[PDB]
Scaffold this motif. Structure first.
Motif, PDB file in Angstrom:
ATOM      1  N   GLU A   1     -15.815 -47.307   7.733  1.00  0.00           N
ATOM      2  CA  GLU A   1     -16.584 -46.266   8.422  1.00  0.00           C
ATOM      3  C   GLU A   1     -16.148 -44.836   8.066  1.00  0.00           C
ATOM      4  OE1 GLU A   1     -17.720 -48.755  12.528  1.00  0.00           O
ATOM      5  OE2 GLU A   1     -16.166 -47.211  12.617  1.00  0.00           O
ATOM      6  N   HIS A   2     -15.166 -44.682   7.171  1.00  0.00           N
ATOM      7  CA  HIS A   2     -14.640 -43.361   6.807  1.00  0.00           C
ATOM      8  C   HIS A   2     -14.248 -43.247   5.327  1.00  0.00           C
ATOM      9  CE1 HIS A   2     -14.145 -42.036  11.015  1.00  0.00           C
ATOM     10  NE2 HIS A   2     -13.750 -43.272  11.264  1.00  0.00           N
ATOM     11  N   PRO A   3     -14.637 -42.140   4.654  1.00  0.00           N
ATOM     12  CA  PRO A   3     -14.138 -41.909   3.298  1.00  0.00           C
ATOM     13  C   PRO A   3     -12.666 -41.510   3.353  1.00  0.00           C
ATOM     14  CG  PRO A   3     -16.007 -40.460   3.810  1.00  0.00           C
ATOM     15  CD  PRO A   3     -15.557 -41.075   5.089  1.00  0.00           C
ATOM     16  N   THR A   4     -11.829 -42.180   2.565  1.00  0.00           N
ATOM     17  CA  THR A   4     -10.383 -41.974   2.606  1.00  0.00           C
ATOM     18  C   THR A   4      -9.881 -41.168   1.412  1.00  0.00           C
ATOM     19  OG1 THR A   4     -10.083 -44.111   3.750  1.00  0.00           O
ATOM     20  CG2 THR A   4      -8.129 -43.146   2.702  1.00  0.00           C
ATOM     21  N   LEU A   5      -9.007 -40.194   1.672  1.00  0.00           N
ATOM     22  CA  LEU A   5      -8.385 -39.387   0.614  1.00  0.00           C
ATOM     23  C   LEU A   5      -6.928 -39.785   0.438  1.00  0.00           C
ATOM     24  CD1 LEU A   5      -8.502 -37.022  -1.426  1.00  0.00           C
ATOM     25  CD2 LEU A   5      -7.843 -35.506   0.444  1.00  0.00           C
TER      26      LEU A   5
ATOM     27  N   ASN B   1     -12.713 -52.087   1.981  1.00  0.00           N
ATOM     28  CA  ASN B   1     -14.158 -51.796   2.030  1.00  0.00           C
ATOM     29  C   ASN B   1     -14.564 -50.329   2.227  1.00  0.00           C
ATOM     30  OD1 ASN B   1     -14.833 -54.520   1.639  1.00  0.00           O
ATOM     31  ND2 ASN B   1     -15.075 -54.947   3.835  1.00  0.00           N
ATOM     32  N   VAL B   2     -13.771 -49.385   1.721  1.00  0.00           N
ATOM     33  CA  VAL B   2     -14.070 -47.961   1.937  1.00  0.00           C
ATOM     34  C   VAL B   2     -15.440 -47.558   1.371  1.00  0.00           C
ATOM     35  CG1 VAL B   2     -11.640 -47.302   1.980  1.00  0.00           C
ATOM     36  CG2 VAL B   2     -12.922 -47.192  -0.174  1.00  0.00           C
ATOM     37  N   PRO B   3     -16.154 -46.652   2.067  1.00  0.00           N
ATOM     38  CA  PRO B   3     -17.472 -46.184   1.612  1.00  0.00           C
ATOM     39  C   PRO B   3     -17.352 -45.226   0.425  1.00  0.00           C
ATOM     40  CG  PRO B   3     -16.813 -44.967   3.559  1.00  0.00           C
ATOM     41  CD  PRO B   3     -15.747 -46.002   3.328  1.00  0.00           C
ATOM     42  N   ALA B   4     -16.218 -44.528   0.369  1.00  0.00           N
ATOM     43  CA  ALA B   4     -15.875 -43.639  -0.735  1.00  0.00           C
ATOM     44  C   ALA B   4     -14.388 -43.362  -0.672  1.00  0.00           C
ATOM     45  CB  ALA B   4     -16.650 -42.336  -0.651  1.00  0.00           C
ATOM     46  N   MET B   5     -13.850 -42.771  -1.734  1.00  0.00           N
ATOM     47  CA  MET B   5     -12.440 -42.338  -1.762  1.00  0.00           C
ATOM     48  C   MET B   5     -12.135 -41.481  -2.996  1.00  0.00           C
ATOM     49  SD  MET B   5     -10.642 -44.456  -4.154  1.00  0.00           S
ATOM     50  CE  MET B   5      -8.974 -44.601  -3.520  1.00  0.00           C
TER      51      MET B   5
ATOM     52  N   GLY C   1      -4.875 -31.745   1.493  1.00  0.00           N
ATOM     53  CA  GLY C   1      -5.963 -32.736   1.430  1.00  0.00           C
ATOM     54  C   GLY C   1      -6.975 -32.627   2.557  1.00  0.00           C
ATOM     55  N   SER C   2      -6.507 -32.197   3.727  1.00  0.00           N
ATOM     56  CA  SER C   2      -7.361 -31.967   4.887  1.00  0.00           C
ATOM     57  C   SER C   2      -8.326 -30.812   4.617  1.00  0.00           C
ATOM     58  CB  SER C   2      -6.499 -31.663   6.114  1.00  0.00           C
ATOM     59  OG  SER C   2      -7.287 -31.488   7.274  1.00  0.00           O
ATOM     60  N   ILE C   3      -7.856 -29.823   3.858  1.00  0.00           N
ATOM     61  CA  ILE C   3      -8.680 -28.683   3.457  1.00  0.00           C
ATOM     62  C   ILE C   3      -9.652 -29.104   2.359  1.00  0.00           C
ATOM     63  CG2 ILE C   3      -8.706 -26.404   2.393  1.00  0.00           C
ATOM     64  CD1 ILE C   3      -5.767 -26.128   3.480  1.00  0.00           C
ATOM     65  N   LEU C   4      -9.113 -29.750   1.322  1.00  0.00           N
ATOM     66  CA  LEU C   4      -9.894 -30.220   0.173  1.00  0.00           C
ATOM     67  C   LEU C   4     -11.016 -31.169   0.594  1.00  0.00           C
ATOM     68  CD1 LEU C   4      -9.893 -30.060  -2.996  1.00  0.00           C
ATOM     69  CD2 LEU C   4      -8.707 -32.258  -2.961  1.00  0.00           C
TER      70      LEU C   4
ATOM     71  N   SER D   1     -16.765 -27.803   0.620  1.00  0.00           N
ATOM     72  CA  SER D   1     -18.132 -28.090   0.167  1.00  0.00           C
ATOM     73  C   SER D   1     -18.172 -28.502  -1.306  1.00  0.00           C
ATOM     74  CB  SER D   1     -19.035 -26.863   0.379  1.00  0.00           C
ATOM     75  OG  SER D   1     -20.268 -26.994  -0.321  1.00  0.00           O
ATOM     76  N   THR D   2     -17.363 -27.835  -2.124  1.00  0.00           N
ATOM     77  CA  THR D   2     -17.337 -28.100  -3.563  1.00  0.00           C
ATOM     78  C   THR D   2     -16.750 -29.474  -3.896  1.00  0.00           C
ATOM     79  OG1 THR D   2     -17.053 -25.712  -3.997  1.00  0.00           O
ATOM     80  CG2 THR D   2     -16.596 -27.228  -5.846  1.00  0.00           C
ATOM     81  N   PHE D   3     -15.868 -29.977  -3.031  1.00  0.00           N
ATOM     82  CA  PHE D   3     -15.207 -31.261  -3.265  1.00  0.00           C
ATOM     83  C   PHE D   3     -16.125 -32.447  -2.988  1.00  0.00           C
ATOM     84  CE2 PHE D   3     -12.478 -34.785  -1.577  1.00  0.00           C
ATOM     85  CZ  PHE D   3     -11.956 -35.176  -2.797  1.00  0.00           C
ATOM     86  N   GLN D   4     -17.091 -32.259  -2.096  1.00  0.00           N
ATOM     87  CA  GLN D   4     -17.976 -33.347  -1.684  1.00  0.00           C
ATOM     88  C   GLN D   4     -18.583 -34.111  -2.866  1.00  0.00           C
ATOM     89  OE1 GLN D   4     -17.685 -34.205   1.551  1.00  0.00           O
ATOM     90  NE2 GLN D   4     -16.336 -32.410   1.540  1.00  0.00           N
ATOM     91  N   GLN D   5     -18.970 -33.401  -3.920  1.00  0.00           N
ATOM     92  CA  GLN D   5     -19.539 -34.053  -5.108  1.00  0.00           C
ATOM     93  C   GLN D   5     -18.525 -34.929  -5.839  1.00  0.00           C
ATOM     94  OE1 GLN D   5     -20.758 -31.066  -8.029  1.00  0.00           O
ATOM     95  NE2 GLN D   5     -19.092 -29.743  -7.315  1.00  0.00           N
ATOM     96  N   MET D   6     -17.252 -34.568  -5.726  1.00  0.00           N
ATOM     97  CA  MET D   6     -16.194 -35.255  -6.458  1.00  0.00           C
ATOM     98  C   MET D   6     -15.769 -36.601  -5.846  1.00  0.00           C
ATOM     99  SD  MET D   6     -13.902 -32.035  -7.864  1.00  0.00           S
ATOM    100  CE  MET D   6     -14.708 -30.619  -8.652  1.00  0.00           C
TER     101      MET D   6
END
Ligand SMILES: Nc1ncnc2c1ncn2[C@@H]1O[C@H](COP(=O)(O)OP(=O)(O)OP(=O)(O)O)[C@@H](O)[C@H]1O
Ligand SMILES: Nc1ncnc2c1ncn2[C@@H]1O[C@H](COP(=O)(O)OP(=O)(O)OP(=O)(O)O)[C@@H](O)[C@H]1O
Ligand SMILES: C/C1=C/C(=O)O[C@@H]2C[C@@H](CC[C@H](C)C=CC=CCC1)O[C@@](O)([C@@H]1CSC(=O)N1)C2
Ligand SMILES: C/C1=C/C(=O)O[C@@H]2C[C@@H](CC[C@H](C)C=CC=CCC1)O[C@@](O)([C@@H]1CSC(=O)N1)C2
Ligand SMILES: [Ca+2]
Ligand SMILES: [Ca+2]
Lengths: 335, 335
Positions: free
Chosen positions: B69-73, B97-101, B312-315, B319-324
């Motif tokens: 349920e959460h994208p993990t960094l 099962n992460v949705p993104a990372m 990482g909390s900032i990154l 907005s610019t990181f979302q695509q990455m």
């Protein structure tokens, strides 16, 4: 529905119910046959037919209960053979029809009685003495020390050293009188030489004792020479190490991480550890053998005559222990 | 919908949600097995089955969230092998099962935490120390310096140099007490000789410390000799260069255009850089090795124990990181 707790010792049997503050029955581990016989020698069951007579007496004569109506908690000396334990279990499920039962290590119970999971116990009974190092509730077997020297040996030695003073304690009935003395007057001298010197120069350490037949008698240095055997077993022809030494050895046979905690937790169990001044002695003696920066501490609880029984009354009553029982179904299934 | 941030370190794991001011969970990177085991050594994952147990604990025991349920960094030490990173990604998409990372370079995050895209970071943790020069957000790989010397090595050294004073810190439980001291009392001496001379002549640099068991102890020069190892690793048998030197080397391995800016931006991350007086020292030491006309500046932020997590909390929140990000669809497609 109520659980039992049966502490079987070489000298005495301490029996009672789980949850109680103290055992209700405390009786000798003997079987007369013209004459008497101790089925447990050095904390180990040597005669099984006799041992059944003891358990039979326990349930029906002492506790006055049906053994099939109560789960029974039996005790065992440390490093007790597996064939010894499997033989106990069989007798409980088959001869006494118990609904469940469990066999716990005497020394380990004494630790729990103190309120500890980790620590090095010293349990000196009437038949055997043990140094049992325990970590997180598990008694480390390779580190356990045994010593075939306890109250009975000590009672016998006292009789001997009273014979040189002119007294005549030889018969077994008289031996009990010498046991009473041993329990009543004796003590552990902080320093042996100093004490003996006080005895040679003055009569301040002398104590009177009224014998059953009214007559009075006096004892001086025997008071502390008798319990001294514990620190120097060679007094009675034993090339074994003392209790301070075997306690040290025990700790050195453990992992280095837990030693600090063993030293800091020296629990004392069994009636032979009831000698006045034994704690001050074990502190002194250990302090010397161990490093300087080490914090040594000796815990000698007032009710340490029954620490093993008390340990089982608590354990039997615990929620976590309930799963560890052995149902007759489990036995009649798995053996 | 909320993003996570999991900083996995050799010593500690700093976990929390993206957007937060600080991590909500901070716990040891250990797995007990009788006994303990650090799956991350020198900032690199050595045991994967264990590492999963850590991430499992993170999500369910610490953060109490569903990983799907959460994208993990996730974070990684600089110059982390590619097979190491590809193995992380696999475990997140398949086991959790992460949705993104996304996997970011620890030191680089610390720079962003400071508010900088370009600069030479010094990140000293518990397991490894790194000099990472970064230009316009990209950490220059050929210029990165590594050093297998951090807080744990330092804690061990302190134990050793306290043993000569007569103390006995050997066990692992005691090692934590020596870590506490190291964190509590120690400092970085501006000049070693001068300080040692103050210690030899006076008792002004001495400090008392209350041990867990109440007793008090005193420490003098150990306060600054311990952290000194960072500037002179040969104190513990390491022929490697100091942190001032490896920082200099790092800058000289870069392009000449950016050196002025690297010197002017010496960020400090990791708990091992928390020693009082380390900034005044690194200024001094660097000033000497570098030219005269060079403007040197050391940035040591108060919350530099958690600069990597904060980075990482900032990154994650940008907005610019979302695509990455890397969607599970992207992975299950492209691998
Ligand atoms: N005040 C006392 N001082 C010294 N010894 C005592 C005292 N009271 C009892 N004892 C001794 O303690 C012993 C009994 O202790 P305990 O019941 O723990 O031993 P046991 O369980 O019968 O034998 P073991 O535990 O060795 O198998 C006897 O030898 C008894 O004489
Ligand atoms: N006040 C302090 N002074 C000195 N050292 C400290 C202080 N506080 C914490 N530390 C040390 O900092 C280290 C923890 O920092 P950090 O969490 O950044 O390292 P890590 O991420 O666990 O390991 P690494 O980053 O090397 O993989 C420990 O060695 C700890 O003892
Ligand atoms: C109060 C008491 C404590 C006790 O521990 O007795 C136990 C049991 C006793 C059994 C034999 C005697 C005759 C019968 C009876 C007695 C009652 C119990 C006596 O034999 C001991 O005395 C031996 C001998 S001498 C010694 O040190 N152990 C230990
Ligand atoms: C407040 C704290 C900070 C910390 O950084 O601990 C981490 C993690 C710790 C794990 C092993 C110990 C027993 C268990 C527990 C503890 C809680 C975390 C302790 O092992 C370190 O101590 C090592 C050893 S000595 C050193 O320098 N690194 C680093
Ligand atoms: Ca006993
Ligand atoms: Ca780190």
């Amino acid at each position: 529905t109520t659980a039992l707790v049966c502490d079987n010792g070489s000298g005495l049997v301490k029996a009672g119910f789980a949850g109680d503050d103290a055992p209700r029955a405390v009786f000798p581990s003997i079987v007369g046959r013209p004459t008497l016989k101790y089925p447990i020698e050095h904390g180990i069951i040597t005669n099984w037919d006799d041992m059944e007579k003891i358990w039979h007496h326990t349930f029906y004569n002492e506790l006055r209960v049906a053994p099939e109506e109560h789960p029974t908690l039996l005790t065992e000396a440390p490093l007790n053979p597996k064939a010894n334990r499997e033989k106990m279990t069989q007798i409980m499920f088959e001869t006494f029809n118990v609904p469940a039962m469990y066999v716990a290590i005497q020394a380990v119970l004494s630790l729990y009685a103190s309120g500890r999971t980790t620590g090095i116990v010293l349990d000196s009974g009437d038949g055997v003495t043990h140094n049992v190092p325990i970590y997180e509730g598990y008694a480390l077997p390779h580190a356990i020390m045994r010593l075939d020297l306890a109250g009975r040996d000590l009672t016998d030695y006292l009789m001997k050293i009273l014979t040189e003073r002119g007294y005549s304690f030889v018969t077994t009935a008289e031996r009990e009188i010498v046991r009473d003395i041993k329990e009543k007057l004796c003590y552990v001298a902080l320093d042996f030489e100093n004490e003996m010197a006080t005895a040679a120069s003055s009569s301040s350490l002398e104590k009177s004792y009224e014998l059953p037949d009214g007559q009075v008698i006096t004892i001086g240095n025997e008071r502390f020479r008798c319990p001294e055997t514990l620190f120097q077993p060679s007094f009675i022809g034993m090339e074994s190490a003392g209790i301070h030494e075997t306690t040290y050895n025990s700790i050195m046979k453990c992992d280095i991480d837990i030693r600090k905690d063993l030293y800091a937790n020296n629990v004392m169990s069994g009636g032979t550890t009831m000698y006045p001044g034994i704690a001050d002695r074990m502190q002194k003696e250990i302090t010397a053998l161990a490093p300087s920066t080490m914090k040594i501490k000796i815990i000698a609880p007032p009710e340490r005559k029954y620490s093993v029984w008390i340990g089982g009354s608590i354990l039997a009553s615990l929620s976590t222990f309930q799963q560890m029982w052995i149902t007759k179904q489990e036995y009649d299934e798995a053996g």
